Short mmCIF file of C-alpha atoms in Angstrom, two decimals:
data_model
loop_
_atom_site.label_atom_id
_atom_site.label_comp_id
_atom_site.label_asym_id
_atom_site.label_seq_id
_atom_site.Cartn_x
_atom_site.Cartn_y
_atom_site.Cartn_z
CA UNK A 1 49.51 66.00 -5.64
CA UNK A 2 46.56 64.30 -3.99
CA UNK A 3 45.64 62.40 -0.75
CA UNK A 4 43.08 59.68 0.13
CA UNK A 5 42.33 58.37 3.38
CA UNK A 6 39.68 56.16 4.89
CA UNK A 7 37.56 57.69 7.80
CA UNK A 8 35.94 55.15 10.16
CA UNK A 9 33.00 55.64 12.71
CA UNK A 10 34.18 55.57 16.23
CA UNK A 11 31.09 53.54 17.44
CA UNK A 12 27.90 51.86 16.29
CA UNK A 13 25.93 55.09 16.12
CA UNK A 14 28.36 57.18 13.87
CA UNK A 15 28.89 59.60 16.84
CA UNK A 16 32.04 60.59 14.97
CA UNK A 17 34.57 59.47 12.46
CA UNK A 18 38.31 59.06 12.68
CA UNK A 19 41.01 59.17 10.08
CA UNK A 20 44.60 58.16 10.36
CA UNK A 21 47.14 60.92 10.16
CA UNK A 22 50.98 60.64 10.17
CA UNK A 23 52.79 63.27 12.32
CA UNK A 24 56.57 63.58 12.57
CA UNK A 25 59.62 61.67 11.66
CA UNK A 26 59.48 58.78 12.10
CA UNK A 27 55.80 58.94 11.48
CA UNK A 28 53.50 58.73 14.57
CA UNK A 29 50.00 57.79 13.58
CA UNK A 30 47.16 59.39 15.35
CA UNK A 31 43.48 59.08 14.63
CA UNK A 32 41.98 62.38 14.22
CA UNK A 33 38.53 63.88 13.92
CA UNK A 34 38.39 65.74 10.62
CA UNK A 35 36.26 68.77 11.46
CA UNK A 36 35.04 71.23 8.71
CA UNK A 37 33.48 73.25 11.66
CA UNK A 38 36.86 74.35 13.11
CA UNK A 39 40.45 75.30 12.03
CA UNK A 40 42.90 73.97 14.56
CA UNK A 41 44.92 70.78 14.20
CA UNK A 42 45.41 69.61 17.80
CA UNK A 43 46.52 66.45 19.40
CA UNK A 44 46.89 64.45 22.56
CA UNK A 45 50.46 64.67 23.40
CA UNK A 46 53.22 63.79 25.86
CA UNK A 47 52.49 67.22 27.26
CA UNK A 48 48.89 66.46 28.04
CA UNK A 49 48.12 66.27 31.79
CA UNK A 50 48.46 62.66 32.53
CA UNK A 51 45.18 62.38 34.42
CA UNK A 52 43.38 63.68 31.23
CA UNK A 53 44.87 60.99 28.97
CA UNK A 54 42.74 57.63 29.12
CA UNK A 55 43.59 55.41 26.25
CA UNK A 56 44.34 57.99 23.42
CA UNK A 57 47.52 57.66 21.25
CA UNK A 58 49.76 60.65 22.02
CA UNK A 59 52.02 62.65 19.79
CA UNK A 60 55.59 63.05 21.38
CA UNK A 61 57.33 66.04 19.62
CA UNK A 62 60.69 65.05 21.21
CA UNK A 63 60.74 61.67 19.22
CA UNK A 64 60.23 63.50 15.96
CA UNK A 65 63.37 64.83 14.14
CA UNK A 66 61.36 67.31 12.22
CA UNK A 67 59.43 68.72 15.06
CA UNK A 68 60.35 72.43 16.02
CA UNK A 69 58.67 74.46 18.93
CA UNK A 70 56.74 77.35 17.53
CA UNK A 71 58.19 79.76 20.10
CA UNK A 72 55.89 81.74 22.05
CA UNK A 73 52.52 80.29 20.34
CA UNK A 74 49.71 79.01 22.31
CA UNK A 75 46.06 77.91 21.44
CA UNK A 76 42.86 77.46 23.24
CA UNK A 77 39.61 76.24 21.77
CA UNK A 78 35.87 75.96 22.88
CA UNK A 79 33.60 73.86 20.77
CA UNK A 80 29.82 74.20 20.43
CA UNK A 81 29.26 71.12 22.54
CA UNK A 82 30.85 72.83 25.50
CA UNK A 83 34.12 70.81 25.14
CA UNK A 84 37.52 72.48 25.18
CA UNK A 85 41.36 72.09 24.82
CA UNK A 86 44.49 74.29 24.92
CA UNK A 87 48.27 74.10 24.86
CA UNK A 88 51.39 75.11 22.92
CA UNK A 89 52.52 74.59 19.30
CA UNK A 90 55.00 72.84 17.14
CA UNK A 91 55.69 72.80 13.41
CA UNK A 92 56.11 69.19 12.06
CA UNK A 93 55.55 67.15 8.79
CA UNK A 94 51.96 66.05 8.51
CA UNK A 95 50.60 63.43 5.94
CA UNK A 96 47.07 62.39 5.19
CA UNK A 97 46.51 59.60 2.92
CA UNK A 98 49.75 60.10 1.02
CA UNK A 99 49.66 63.94 0.93
CA UNK A 100 52.40 65.57 2.82
CA UNK A 101 52.50 69.11 4.29
CA UNK A 102 55.88 70.16 5.88
CA UNK A 103 55.77 72.86 8.46
CA UNK A 104 52.25 72.23 9.65
CA UNK A 105 51.16 73.66 12.81
CA UNK A 106 50.50 70.89 15.23
CA UNK A 107 48.82 71.99 18.34
CA UNK A 108 49.89 69.99 21.33
CA UNK A 109 47.36 69.79 24.03
CA UNK A 110 48.40 70.52 27.60
CA UNK A 111 44.87 70.34 28.95
CA UNK A 112 41.52 68.78 27.46
CA UNK A 113 38.17 68.80 28.89
CA UNK A 114 36.44 65.70 30.27
CA UNK A 115 34.59 64.64 26.99
CA UNK A 116 37.90 64.37 25.22
CA UNK A 117 39.36 62.42 27.94
CA UNK A 118 36.41 60.09 28.14
CA UNK A 119 36.66 59.25 24.32
CA UNK A 120 39.51 56.98 24.01
CA UNK A 121 39.06 56.61 20.13
CA UNK A 122 39.84 60.31 19.22
CA UNK A 123 43.43 61.30 19.42
CA UNK A 124 42.68 64.97 18.41
CA UNK A 125 41.02 67.03 15.64
CA UNK A 126 42.14 68.11 12.22
CA UNK A 127 40.21 71.40 11.39
CA UNK A 128 39.12 72.02 7.81
CA UNK A 129 37.18 75.29 8.17
CA UNK A 130 38.67 78.55 7.05
CA UNK A 131 41.95 79.45 8.65
CA UNK A 132 40.57 82.78 9.86
CA UNK A 133 39.16 80.58 12.78
CA UNK A 134 42.49 79.16 13.90
CA UNK A 135 43.04 80.04 17.56
CA UNK A 136 46.97 80.22 17.70
CA UNK A 137 48.19 83.25 19.21
CA UNK A 138 49.92 85.52 18.65
CA UNK A 139 50.54 84.30 15.01
CA UNK A 140 47.43 82.69 13.51
CA UNK A 141 48.22 79.30 11.71
CA UNK A 142 46.94 77.79 8.51
CA UNK A 143 44.92 74.55 8.22
CA UNK A 144 46.28 71.44 6.67
CA UNK A 145 44.12 72.12 3.58
CA UNK A 146 45.17 75.72 3.27
CA UNK A 147 48.80 74.69 3.44
CA UNK A 148 48.45 71.68 1.02
CA UNK A 149 46.09 73.74 -1.45
CA UNK A 150 48.86 75.15 -3.83
CA UNK A 151 50.36 71.64 -4.36
CA UNK A 152 46.97 69.83 -4.95
CA UNK A 153 45.88 68.98 -8.46
CA UNK A 154 42.64 70.90 -7.90
CA UNK A 155 42.03 72.96 -4.66
CA UNK A 156 39.41 70.87 -3.23
CA UNK A 157 38.77 68.09 -0.75
CA UNK A 158 35.70 65.83 -0.47
CA UNK A 159 33.80 64.07 2.48
CA UNK A 160 32.23 60.81 1.73
CA UNK A 161 31.00 59.58 5.22
CA UNK A 162 29.56 56.22 5.58
CA UNK A 163 26.29 55.21 7.36
CA UNK A 164 27.42 52.58 9.86
CA UNK A 165 30.49 52.06 7.59
CA UNK A 166 33.72 53.47 6.58
CA UNK A 167 34.10 56.26 4.02
CA UNK A 168 36.75 58.60 2.54
CA UNK A 169 38.19 61.93 2.66
CA UNK A 170 40.06 62.89 -0.58
CA UNK A 171 42.32 65.86 -1.23
CA UNK A 172 42.98 67.41 -4.61
CA UNK A 173 40.68 65.49 -6.84
CA UNK A 174 37.02 64.56 -7.26
CA UNK A 175 36.38 60.56 -7.48
CA UNK A 176 33.71 60.61 -10.18
CA UNK A 177 33.12 56.93 -9.27
CA UNK A 178 32.02 57.89 -5.63
CA UNK A 179 28.55 59.38 -6.44
CA UNK A 180 25.51 59.02 -8.71
CA UNK A 181 24.26 61.76 -11.03
CA UNK A 182 25.75 65.16 -11.04
CA UNK A 183 27.25 67.35 -8.29
CA UNK A 184 25.33 70.50 -7.53
CA UNK A 185 27.38 73.54 -6.47
CA UNK A 186 26.11 76.22 -4.22
CA UNK A 187 27.38 79.47 -2.88
CA UNK A 188 29.42 79.68 0.24
CA UNK A 189 29.86 82.61 2.71
CA UNK A 190 33.25 82.64 4.54
CA UNK A 191 32.19 85.53 6.64
CA UNK A 192 32.02 83.49 9.80
CA UNK A 193 34.90 81.22 8.75
CA UNK A 194 32.58 78.35 8.15
CA UNK A 195 31.55 76.42 4.93
CA UNK A 196 28.29 78.31 5.34
CA UNK A 197 25.63 77.86 2.57
CA UNK A 198 21.79 78.24 2.06
CA UNK A 199 19.75 75.22 1.54
CA UNK A 200 16.60 75.76 -0.61
CA UNK A 201 14.18 73.72 1.54
CA UNK A 202 13.24 70.48 2.86
CA UNK A 203 10.65 67.65 2.83
CA UNK A 204 9.51 65.05 5.41
CA UNK A 205 9.07 61.59 4.20
CA UNK A 206 7.02 61.52 1.03
CA UNK A 207 5.60 64.82 1.74
CA UNK A 208 5.71 67.81 -0.47
CA UNK A 209 8.91 69.86 -0.78
CA UNK A 210 8.81 73.28 1.21
CA UNK A 211 10.85 75.87 -0.51
CA UNK A 212 12.45 77.96 2.08
CA UNK A 213 16.07 79.41 2.51
CA UNK A 214 17.96 77.64 5.48
CA UNK A 215 21.31 79.15 5.96
CA UNK A 216 23.74 76.73 7.77
CA UNK A 217 27.20 75.17 7.82
CA UNK A 218 28.52 72.02 6.55
CA UNK A 219 30.12 70.57 9.61
CA UNK A 220 31.74 67.14 9.65
CA UNK A 221 32.56 67.50 13.40
CA UNK A 222 28.98 67.73 14.51
CA UNK A 223 27.13 64.44 14.78
CA UNK A 224 23.63 65.60 14.20
CA UNK A 225 21.38 67.81 11.98
CA UNK A 226 20.33 71.09 13.63
CA UNK A 227 17.63 72.98 12.04
CA UNK A 228 15.04 75.72 12.76
CA UNK A 229 12.55 74.72 15.32
CA UNK A 230 9.66 74.85 12.87
CA UNK A 231 11.38 72.45 10.48
CA UNK A 232 12.16 70.07 13.40
CA UNK A 233 8.68 70.11 14.76
CA UNK A 234 7.35 69.37 11.26
CA UNK A 235 9.79 66.48 11.05
CA UNK A 236 8.96 64.82 14.53
CA UNK A 237 5.22 65.39 14.15
CA UNK A 238 5.28 62.68 11.63
CA UNK A 239 6.64 60.17 14.28
CA UNK A 240 3.89 58.80 16.62
CA UNK A 241 4.95 59.42 20.29
CA UNK A 242 7.81 61.66 19.40
CA UNK A 243 8.32 64.60 21.79
CA UNK A 244 10.83 67.22 22.87
CA UNK A 245 12.32 66.43 26.30
CA UNK A 246 13.97 69.11 28.22
CA UNK A 247 15.36 66.54 30.74
CA UNK A 248 16.96 64.52 27.87
CA UNK A 249 17.99 67.62 25.89
CA UNK A 250 16.12 67.28 22.69
CA UNK A 251 13.58 65.24 20.63
CA UNK A 252 13.09 61.43 21.57
CA UNK A 253 11.00 59.06 20.03
CA UNK A 254 9.72 55.32 20.64
CA UNK A 255 12.61 52.98 19.73
CA UNK A 256 9.85 50.83 18.00
CA UNK A 257 9.28 53.48 15.50
CA UNK A 258 10.21 53.40 11.71
CA UNK A 259 11.48 57.06 11.06
CA UNK A 260 10.63 58.86 7.82
CA UNK A 261 13.33 60.20 5.59
CA UNK A 262 14.29 63.79 5.40
CA UNK A 263 15.14 65.65 2.39
CA UNK A 264 17.10 68.88 1.96
CA UNK A 265 17.37 71.15 -1.09
CA UNK A 266 20.81 72.01 -2.77
CA UNK A 267 19.65 74.49 -5.39
CA UNK A 268 17.24 72.51 -7.69
CA UNK A 269 18.81 69.13 -6.41
CA UNK A 270 17.67 67.13 -3.49
CA UNK A 271 19.52 64.90 -0.95
CA UNK A 272 17.51 62.31 0.83
CA UNK A 273 18.56 61.31 4.40
CA UNK A 274 16.97 57.83 4.92
CA UNK A 275 14.90 57.50 8.29
CA UNK A 276 17.42 54.87 9.70
CA UNK A 277 20.17 57.75 9.54
CA UNK A 278 18.07 59.55 11.97
CA UNK A 279 18.05 57.07 14.88
CA UNK A 280 20.68 57.48 17.51
CA UNK A 281 19.46 54.78 19.68
CA UNK A 282 18.30 54.55 23.34
CA UNK A 283 18.72 57.51 25.37
CA UNK A 284 20.62 55.33 28.24
CA UNK A 285 21.24 51.59 27.93
CA UNK A 286 18.06 49.51 27.75
CA UNK A 287 15.72 52.32 27.28
CA UNK A 288 12.86 52.12 24.93
CA UNK A 289 13.18 55.97 24.31
CA UNK A 290 15.46 56.67 21.46
CA UNK A 291 17.31 59.91 20.70
CA UNK A 292 16.61 61.79 17.42
CA UNK A 293 19.16 62.85 14.90
CA UNK A 294 17.48 65.94 13.78
CA UNK A 295 17.23 68.51 16.55
CA UNK A 296 16.57 72.20 16.92
CA UNK A 297 19.23 74.88 16.41
CA UNK A 298 17.05 77.29 18.34
CA UNK A 299 19.75 77.36 21.08
CA UNK A 300 22.84 77.51 18.97
CA UNK A 301 22.56 80.54 16.69
CA UNK A 302 23.38 78.65 13.47
CA UNK A 303 21.90 75.84 11.62
CA UNK A 304 24.30 72.85 11.39
CA UNK A 305 24.49 70.23 8.66
CA UNK A 306 26.42 67.76 10.58
CA UNK A 307 27.19 64.03 9.90
CA UNK A 308 23.41 63.01 9.68
CA UNK A 309 23.12 65.15 6.65
CA UNK A 310 26.47 64.91 5.11
CA UNK A 311 26.74 61.22 5.15
CA UNK A 312 23.69 60.90 2.81
CA UNK A 313 25.75 62.71 0.16
CA UNK A 314 29.02 63.14 -1.50
CA UNK A 315 30.36 66.55 -0.56
CA UNK A 316 32.81 68.76 -2.42
CA UNK A 317 34.57 71.42 -0.29
CA UNK A 318 35.89 73.66 -3.19
CA UNK A 319 38.65 75.85 -2.02
CA UNK A 320 39.03 77.81 -5.16
CA UNK A 321 39.45 81.63 -4.88
CA UNK A 322 35.78 81.91 -4.42
CA UNK A 323 34.87 78.85 -2.41
CA UNK A 324 31.72 76.83 -3.12
CA UNK A 325 30.21 73.53 -1.89
CA UNK A 326 28.98 70.71 -4.02
CA UNK A 327 26.66 67.86 -3.13
CA UNK A 328 25.79 64.86 -5.06
CA UNK A 329 23.71 61.64 -4.13
CA UNK A 330 25.43 58.44 -3.79
#
């Protein structure tokens, strides 16, 4: 089997991407944030504290003839941005782009933190990291991809995120029309539960490539590109007036600037992020200070190849017995 679904930016900055997902019988369609950096499929629901719902579409398990309470199971998750959610668990039928999994754990939120409530466009998350990170207790649950894998024509999914435009998540096949050149595959460590890999270096603008190993994670659920402070300083030094602002929380730059590109290495291959992809707009409405799309990971503990990086590539998440990642230009 295969599946193919369009993913759409939630706003004009590409802060996140939403993909329609059918849950239950009859189908209830929710727009979920596909997140290769976590492993829980959770949704706003009829169980979510009412004051914490503000415009999201909810899953109502009592209206699904295939929903079953997973007795005794609870979940609770905290994300790197400080947001969180928790609740109980149902199993139900879940379909993405024509690919159907029966018995998928659908984690129903009883509580969500303020950032989730405040974002009316995201009805929940669909985790695509390794199932070892799934938070369901006392019986850990499998991701949608893990449950689908055996049925897929090939045990892969691909992320093709757009810049200020829709893109595609495919399951079970590699669309050879969706990228240019060849796909370069690189090794993955699953030891932390992430799609963790090692970039071979970087360049800023038309500058020379610096060969250096950068371990990080391919994370569709993180907006920006978080890299070591040395790399980030070298990038922003090429932008007149750019500075790191403790009060804003990262590098800012004059909105009048034209940003240089940023290149990252995948083996001997190179992925070029155009400068425009690194502009996240005014820090507050009407400001002439703009927020940068490349930020230091120094306070995180891990480097994160988020959407800024991934949207410059066609990315293969290869879930073969030994997982690997593939990157192609597009």
